[PDB]
Short mmCIF file of C-alpha atoms in Angstrom, two decimals:
data_model
loop_
_atom_site.label_atom_id
_atom_site.label_comp_id
_atom_site.label_asym_id
_atom_site.label_seq_id
_atom_site.Cartn_x
_atom_site.Cartn_y
_atom_site.Cartn_z
CA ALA A 1 261.24 157.06 181.36
CA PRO A 2 263.00 154.20 183.15
CA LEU A 3 263.76 150.98 181.31
CA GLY A 4 260.65 148.82 181.17
CA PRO A 5 258.12 146.77 179.16
CA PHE A 6 256.32 149.67 177.50
CA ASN A 7 256.54 152.09 174.61
CA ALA A 8 258.72 154.69 176.33
CA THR A 9 258.00 157.37 173.71
CA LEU A 10 254.22 157.11 174.15
CA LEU A 11 254.45 156.90 177.94
CA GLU A 12 256.66 160.00 178.12
CA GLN A 13 254.36 161.82 175.69
CA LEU A 14 251.33 161.02 177.87
CA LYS A 15 253.16 162.11 181.04
CA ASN A 16 254.28 165.41 179.49
CA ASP A 17 250.88 166.26 178.01
CA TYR A 18 249.08 165.38 181.25
CA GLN A 19 251.48 167.55 183.25
CA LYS A 20 251.02 170.51 180.90
CA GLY A 21 247.23 170.14 181.10
CA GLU A 22 246.37 169.33 177.48
CA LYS A 23 242.64 168.67 177.15
CA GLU A 24 242.60 165.45 175.10
CA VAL A 25 245.29 163.63 177.10
CA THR A 26 243.74 164.90 180.35
CA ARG A 27 240.31 163.45 179.64
CA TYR A 28 241.86 160.20 178.37
CA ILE A 29 243.86 159.85 181.59
CA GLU A 30 240.74 160.62 183.64
CA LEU A 31 238.94 157.77 181.89
CA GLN A 32 241.92 155.52 182.64
CA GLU A 33 241.72 156.50 186.32
CA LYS A 34 238.02 155.61 186.35
CA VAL A 35 239.06 152.26 184.87
CA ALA A 36 241.80 151.75 187.51
CA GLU A 37 239.64 152.41 190.58
CA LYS A 38 238.71 148.70 190.51
CA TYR A 39 242.40 147.77 190.70
CA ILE A 40 242.71 150.15 193.65
CA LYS A 41 239.90 148.21 195.36
CA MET A 42 240.96 144.74 194.18
CA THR A 43 242.38 142.26 196.70
CA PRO A 44 246.00 141.25 195.93
CA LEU A 45 246.13 137.75 194.45
CA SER A 46 248.61 135.05 195.46
CA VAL A 47 250.01 132.04 193.63
CA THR A 48 249.28 130.14 196.87
CA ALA A 49 245.48 130.26 196.41
CA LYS A 50 245.20 126.69 195.14
CA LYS A 51 243.81 123.55 196.75
CA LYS A 52 245.58 120.94 194.60
CA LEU A 53 249.36 121.18 195.30
CA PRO A 54 252.30 120.65 192.93
CA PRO A 55 254.65 117.67 193.35
CA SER A 56 256.84 119.88 195.57
CA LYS A 57 254.00 120.22 198.13
CA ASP A 58 254.77 123.96 198.01
CA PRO A 59 251.77 126.24 197.33
CA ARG A 60 254.29 128.96 196.39
CA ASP A 61 255.39 126.96 193.32
CA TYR A 62 253.62 128.16 190.18
CA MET A 63 251.79 125.31 188.42
CA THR A 64 249.56 125.24 185.33
CA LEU A 65 248.34 122.70 182.77
CA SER A 66 249.72 122.70 179.24
CA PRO A 67 246.66 123.92 177.34
CA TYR A 68 246.60 121.50 174.38
CA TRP A 69 246.93 118.29 176.41
CA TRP A 70 243.83 116.22 177.16
CA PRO A 71 243.03 113.04 179.10
CA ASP A 72 242.99 109.92 176.92
CA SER A 73 239.51 108.45 177.28
CA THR A 74 240.80 105.05 176.08
CA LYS A 75 242.84 104.75 179.31
CA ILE A 76 241.46 103.81 182.72
CA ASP A 77 243.10 106.82 184.41
CA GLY A 78 243.24 109.01 181.28
CA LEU A 79 247.07 108.94 181.34
CA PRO A 80 249.19 109.76 179.52
CA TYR A 81 247.60 112.95 178.19
CA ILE A 82 247.64 113.43 174.42
CA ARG A 83 248.19 116.63 172.45
CA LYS A 84 245.45 118.33 170.39
CA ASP A 85 247.02 121.40 168.79
CA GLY A 86 244.94 124.55 169.17
CA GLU A 87 242.16 123.04 171.33
CA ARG A 88 242.29 124.39 174.89
CA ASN A 89 241.52 121.80 177.57
CA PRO A 90 239.20 123.57 180.07
CA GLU A 91 240.98 121.71 182.90
CA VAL A 92 243.55 124.53 182.67
CA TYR A 93 241.04 126.61 184.63
CA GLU A 94 241.40 124.27 187.62
CA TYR A 95 244.83 125.88 188.16
CA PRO A 96 244.02 129.34 189.57
CA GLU A 97 247.51 130.62 188.70
CA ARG A 98 246.63 130.74 185.00
CA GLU A 99 244.02 133.50 185.24
CA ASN A 100 245.29 135.01 188.50
CA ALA A 101 248.69 135.84 186.98
CA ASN A 102 246.82 137.58 184.16
CA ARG A 103 244.72 139.56 186.65
CA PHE A 104 247.77 140.50 188.74
CA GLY A 105 249.72 141.53 185.65
CA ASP A 106 246.88 143.77 184.49
CA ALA A 107 246.40 145.37 187.92
CA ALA A 108 250.10 146.02 188.55
CA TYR A 109 250.77 147.28 185.01
CA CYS A 110 247.80 149.67 185.06
CA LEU A 111 248.52 151.07 188.53
CA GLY A 112 252.23 151.59 187.84
CA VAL A 113 251.67 153.24 184.45
CA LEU A 114 249.07 155.57 185.94
CA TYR A 115 251.37 156.49 188.83
CA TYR A 116 254.10 157.32 186.32
CA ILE A 117 251.73 159.49 184.29
CA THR A 118 249.87 161.28 187.11
CA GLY A 119 252.24 161.08 190.09
CA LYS A 120 249.30 160.34 192.40
CA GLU A 121 250.63 158.25 195.29
CA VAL A 122 247.47 156.11 195.51
CA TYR A 123 248.45 154.23 192.35
CA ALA A 124 251.96 153.54 193.66
CA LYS A 125 250.47 152.33 196.96
CA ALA A 126 248.04 149.91 195.28
CA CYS A 127 250.70 148.72 192.81
CA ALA A 128 253.08 148.09 195.70
CA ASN A 129 250.46 146.01 197.48
CA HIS A 130 249.98 143.83 194.39
CA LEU A 131 253.73 143.47 193.77
CA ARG A 132 254.50 142.61 197.40
CA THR A 133 251.80 139.95 197.59
CA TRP A 134 252.61 138.26 194.28
CA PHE A 135 256.43 138.42 194.38
CA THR A 136 258.16 138.97 197.71
CA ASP A 137 255.83 138.12 200.62
CA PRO A 138 257.49 135.31 202.64
CA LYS A 139 254.17 133.40 202.77
CA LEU A 140 252.06 134.61 199.82
CA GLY A 141 254.95 135.25 197.43
CA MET A 142 255.68 133.14 194.38
CA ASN A 143 258.85 131.06 194.39
CA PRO A 144 261.24 132.43 191.72
CA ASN A 145 260.95 129.48 189.35
CA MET A 146 258.66 127.90 186.75
CA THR A 147 259.40 124.23 187.44
CA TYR A 148 255.75 123.15 187.22
CA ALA A 149 254.50 125.63 184.62
CA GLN A 150 252.33 123.84 182.03
CA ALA A 151 252.88 120.41 183.51
CA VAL A 152 251.44 117.46 181.59
CA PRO A 153 249.95 114.55 183.60
CA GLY A 154 251.51 111.24 182.61
CA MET A 155 254.52 112.76 180.84
CA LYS A 156 257.72 111.28 182.25
CA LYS A 157 260.08 113.90 180.79
CA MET A 158 260.74 117.43 182.04
CA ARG A 159 259.45 120.23 179.81
CA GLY A 160 260.41 123.89 179.72
CA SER A 161 257.57 125.04 177.45
CA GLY A 162 255.54 126.46 180.35
CA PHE A 163 258.10 129.23 180.85
CA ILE A 164 256.12 131.38 178.40
CA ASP A 165 253.51 131.83 181.16
CA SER A 166 256.05 134.10 182.88
CA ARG A 167 255.20 136.88 180.44
CA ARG A 168 252.04 137.47 182.50
CA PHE A 169 253.94 138.64 185.59
CA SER A 170 257.34 139.63 184.15
CA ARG A 171 255.64 142.70 182.67
CA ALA A 172 254.44 143.53 186.18
CA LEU A 173 258.01 143.11 187.44
CA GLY A 174 259.23 145.65 184.89
CA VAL A 175 256.48 148.10 185.76
CA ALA A 176 257.74 148.14 189.36
CA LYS A 177 260.55 150.36 188.05
CA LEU A 178 257.95 153.12 187.58
CA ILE A 179 257.03 153.29 191.29
CA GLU A 180 260.56 153.48 192.70
CA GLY A 181 260.95 156.75 194.58
CA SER A 182 257.32 156.79 195.72
CA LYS A 183 256.43 156.99 199.40
CA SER A 184 254.84 153.52 199.25
CA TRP A 185 257.67 151.55 197.58
CA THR A 186 260.39 151.65 200.23
CA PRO A 187 264.05 150.80 199.62
CA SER A 188 263.29 147.60 201.55
CA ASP A 189 260.55 146.65 199.06
CA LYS A 190 262.90 147.39 196.16
CA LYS A 191 265.65 145.28 197.75
CA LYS A 192 263.32 142.31 198.22
CA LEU A 193 262.08 142.56 194.63
CA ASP A 194 265.65 142.89 193.33
CA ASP A 195 266.64 139.73 195.20
CA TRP A 196 263.58 137.94 193.80
CA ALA A 197 264.36 139.08 190.25
CA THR A 198 268.00 137.99 190.58
CA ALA A 199 266.91 134.54 191.78
CA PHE A 200 264.37 134.25 188.94
CA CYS A 201 266.99 135.36 186.40
CA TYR A 202 269.40 132.74 187.72
CA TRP A 203 266.70 130.08 187.42
CA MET A 204 265.94 131.33 183.89
CA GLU A 205 269.53 130.94 182.77
CA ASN A 206 270.75 127.90 184.74
CA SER A 207 267.86 125.47 185.18
CA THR A 208 267.64 122.70 182.60
CA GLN A 209 264.16 123.89 181.64
CA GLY A 210 265.32 127.49 181.28
CA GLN A 211 268.23 126.54 179.02
CA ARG A 212 265.98 124.26 176.95
CA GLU A 213 263.46 127.07 176.50
CA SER A 214 266.35 129.43 175.67
CA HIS A 215 267.17 127.19 172.69
CA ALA A 216 263.56 126.85 171.47
CA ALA A 217 263.13 126.98 167.70
CA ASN A 218 259.81 128.85 167.49
CA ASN A 219 257.90 131.69 169.18
CA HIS A 220 258.76 130.10 172.54
CA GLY A 221 262.41 131.09 172.12
CA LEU A 222 261.51 134.65 171.15
CA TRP A 223 259.16 134.97 174.13
CA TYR A 224 261.81 133.46 176.40
CA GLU A 225 264.12 136.27 175.34
CA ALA A 226 261.42 138.93 175.74
CA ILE A 227 260.82 137.72 179.31
CA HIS A 228 264.60 137.64 179.80
CA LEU A 229 264.85 141.26 178.66
CA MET A 230 262.11 142.33 181.08
CA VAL A 231 263.95 140.65 183.97
CA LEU A 232 267.29 142.13 182.86
CA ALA A 233 265.86 145.63 182.39
CA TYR A 234 264.30 145.52 185.85
CA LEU A 235 267.79 144.69 187.17
CA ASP A 236 269.55 147.43 185.11
CA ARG A 237 271.69 144.87 183.23
CA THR A 238 271.83 146.86 180.00
CA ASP A 239 275.03 145.18 178.79
CA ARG A 240 273.31 141.82 179.30
CA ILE A 241 270.40 143.15 177.24
CA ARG A 242 272.84 143.92 174.42
CA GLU A 243 274.45 140.48 174.74
CA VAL A 244 271.04 138.78 174.61
CA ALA A 245 269.88 140.84 171.62
CA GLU A 246 272.98 140.10 169.56
CA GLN A 247 273.69 136.51 170.66
CA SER A 248 270.19 135.05 170.99
CA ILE A 249 267.33 137.19 169.66
CA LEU A 250 268.84 138.09 166.28
CA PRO A 251 270.06 134.53 165.52
CA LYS A 252 266.62 133.14 166.45
CA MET A 253 264.95 135.74 164.23
CA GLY A 254 267.31 134.97 161.35
CA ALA A 255 266.69 131.23 161.60
CA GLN A 256 262.90 131.45 162.06
CA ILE A 257 262.11 133.86 159.19
CA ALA A 258 262.06 132.27 155.74
CA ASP A 259 263.30 133.91 152.55
CA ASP A 260 259.80 135.11 151.63
CA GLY A 261 259.22 136.49 155.15
CA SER A 262 257.01 133.68 156.45
CA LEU A 263 257.53 131.94 159.80
CA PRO A 264 257.58 128.21 158.90
CA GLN A 265 257.55 126.97 162.51
CA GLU A 266 254.26 128.83 163.02
CA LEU A 267 252.75 128.15 159.58
CA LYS A 268 252.47 124.45 160.47
CA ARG A 269 250.16 125.14 163.44
CA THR A 270 246.38 124.88 163.41
CA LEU A 271 246.33 128.56 164.43
CA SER A 272 249.04 129.70 162.04
CA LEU A 273 248.06 133.37 161.77
CA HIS A 274 247.67 133.68 165.54
CA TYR A 275 251.08 132.12 166.18
CA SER A 276 252.86 134.12 163.47
CA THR A 277 251.45 137.24 165.12
CA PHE A 278 252.47 135.85 168.54
CA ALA A 279 256.11 135.51 167.44
CA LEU A 280 256.09 139.05 166.07
CA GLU A 281 254.52 140.19 169.37
CA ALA A 282 257.42 138.66 171.29
CA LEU A 283 259.75 140.64 169.02
CA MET A 284 257.64 143.78 169.56
CA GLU A 285 257.80 143.62 173.35
CA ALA A 286 261.53 142.84 173.25
CA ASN A 287 262.07 145.86 171.00
CA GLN A 288 260.21 148.13 173.42
CA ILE A 289 263.19 147.52 175.72
CA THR A 290 266.05 147.22 173.21
CA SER A 291 265.13 150.44 171.38
CA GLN A 292 265.49 152.35 174.66
CA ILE A 293 269.24 151.55 174.50
CA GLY A 294 269.64 152.15 170.76
CA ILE A 295 268.85 148.72 169.25
CA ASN A 296 265.96 148.52 166.76
CA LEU A 297 265.00 144.84 166.56
CA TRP A 298 262.65 145.61 163.65
CA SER A 299 265.45 146.72 161.31
CA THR A 300 268.65 145.24 162.78
CA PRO A 301 269.75 142.32 160.58
CA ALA A 302 270.73 138.84 161.63
CA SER A 303 274.05 137.43 160.43
CA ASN A 304 272.28 136.19 157.28
CA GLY A 305 270.86 139.66 156.59
CA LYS A 306 267.24 138.81 157.38
CA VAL A 307 265.19 141.41 159.28
CA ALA A 308 261.90 141.21 161.20
CA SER A 309 260.35 143.79 158.88
CA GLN A 310 260.32 141.02 156.27
CA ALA A 311 257.93 139.03 158.47
CA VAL A 312 255.79 142.11 159.10
CA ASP A 313 255.66 142.65 155.32
CA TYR A 314 254.69 139.01 154.73
CA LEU A 315 251.82 139.36 157.21
CA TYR A 316 250.53 142.85 156.29
CA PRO A 317 248.16 141.81 153.42
CA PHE A 318 246.52 139.31 155.79
CA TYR A 319 246.20 141.96 158.48
CA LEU A 320 244.32 143.96 155.86
CA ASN A 321 242.06 141.03 154.88
CA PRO A 322 242.32 138.07 157.29
CA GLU A 323 240.02 136.04 155.03
CA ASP A 324 242.86 135.77 152.48
CA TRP A 325 244.92 133.72 154.96
CA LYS A 326 245.52 130.35 153.30
CA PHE A 327 246.99 128.30 156.18
CA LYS A 328 245.10 126.54 158.96
CA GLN A 329 243.44 128.98 161.38
CA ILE A 330 240.63 127.14 163.17
CA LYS A 331 239.64 130.16 165.27
CA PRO A 332 238.86 133.78 164.36
CA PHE A 333 241.83 136.16 164.44
CA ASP A 334 241.63 139.27 166.63
CA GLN A 335 242.52 142.01 164.16
CA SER A 336 243.03 144.49 167.02
CA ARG A 337 246.36 142.76 167.71
CA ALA A 338 247.47 144.04 164.30
CA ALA A 339 246.72 147.62 165.38
CA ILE A 340 249.41 147.77 168.07
CA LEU A 341 251.85 145.57 166.13
CA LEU A 342 251.62 147.54 162.88
CA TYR A 343 252.04 150.72 164.91
CA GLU A 344 255.08 149.45 166.81
CA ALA A 345 256.72 148.12 163.65
CA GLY A 346 255.53 151.10 161.61
CA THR A 347 257.08 153.84 163.72
CA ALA A 348 260.17 151.66 164.12
CA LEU A 349 260.59 151.57 160.32
CA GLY A 350 259.23 154.96 159.30
CA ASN A 351 256.65 153.02 157.27
CA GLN A 352 253.70 155.41 157.05
CA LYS A 353 251.49 152.73 155.45
CA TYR A 354 251.77 150.50 158.53
CA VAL A 355 250.89 153.36 160.87
CA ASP A 356 247.97 154.48 158.69
CA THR A 357 246.57 150.94 158.70
CA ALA A 358 247.17 150.69 162.46
CA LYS A 359 245.11 153.84 162.99
CA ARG A 360 242.44 152.71 160.51
CA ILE A 361 241.99 149.40 162.35
CA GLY A 362 242.34 151.34 165.59
CA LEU A 363 241.47 150.50 169.17
CA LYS A 364 238.26 151.37 170.97
CA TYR A 365 238.62 154.57 172.98
CA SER A 366 237.13 153.21 176.22
CA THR A 367 238.63 149.70 176.38
CA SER A 368 239.82 148.60 179.81
CA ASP A 369 242.44 146.40 178.11
CA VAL A 370 245.45 147.56 180.10
CA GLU A 371 248.05 146.98 177.38
CA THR A 372 246.24 149.64 175.30
CA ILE A 373 246.83 152.35 177.94
CA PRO A 374 249.81 153.99 176.13
CA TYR A 375 248.01 153.96 172.77
CA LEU A 376 245.75 157.00 172.76
CA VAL A 377 247.36 157.54 169.34
CA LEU A 378 245.31 154.56 168.08
CA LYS A 379 242.08 155.66 169.80
#
């Protein structure tokens, strides 16, 4: 399989078994096709479908609200907003980008994965329509930046924390690699998307916000590098992937994991279990790319000898019984997230206990959750 944001082993296994005609994989893929018909029908979404415009007056600039920032009722205009950790301001849903990037990411990912597995041109055609409209269209396409991602009304300083939103569409970008060579994704389409990805990578690395986010001390830095790896894998910059893994990811991992395996920057949050898992999920998605070029982020040590498996070990008892979690977690934890994680770490470490627990927790066989497509092994 081409380089991309997916478990390449599972995707290749599904493709091979579907091509040979194995019964179980065949019926699973047929269910997935029934799930994807709605994405075939779905109208391609654009970042431009907003009424309230960013400070640039450009509807092609992505803009969202930072979720934990609320109007101050003690002020006449509510400004400046104040931060309430872990409490989502519903005003974030007045920025259509927030949920539309999620919808586009799901549609594109599903259609591209199913084209790769089945070879049916209809999935490549639909996926191309979604990619063209969101990325490269000269009117509907998103500008290759995140200047106004998670903006905060009343804040005078420039923030780069909104860059994490990119993970919603960067995955889609990577999945485009699966439809190259189809009849629907012309060399012209590929050239336009390559130019867009190069411009977005340049913005990533050279904007003040992108640099700031690249030096983030918590899960934001790890997710910045996961997004970076998706952009770099789409562009076939494998040497840059190696540079980023060894110069940025592994130092961040070695600084952010404590001696006992905990993640102190995430333990101080009101949703400490969620955010610990979120950091490990950044590492998981980054490893899906790095392991395709021979770099196992789960067992490769930082300069201080720490390894991400230490954090997985620290969290495992609380993935077994989330009630035992002793730090602040003011919302219920979705244990299904532990199913994929413990699988991805498990197979990456040969740890049969992690994989057995991942299967025991499991995923529901008929979920339309598109990131569970490659995981028939957990269903």
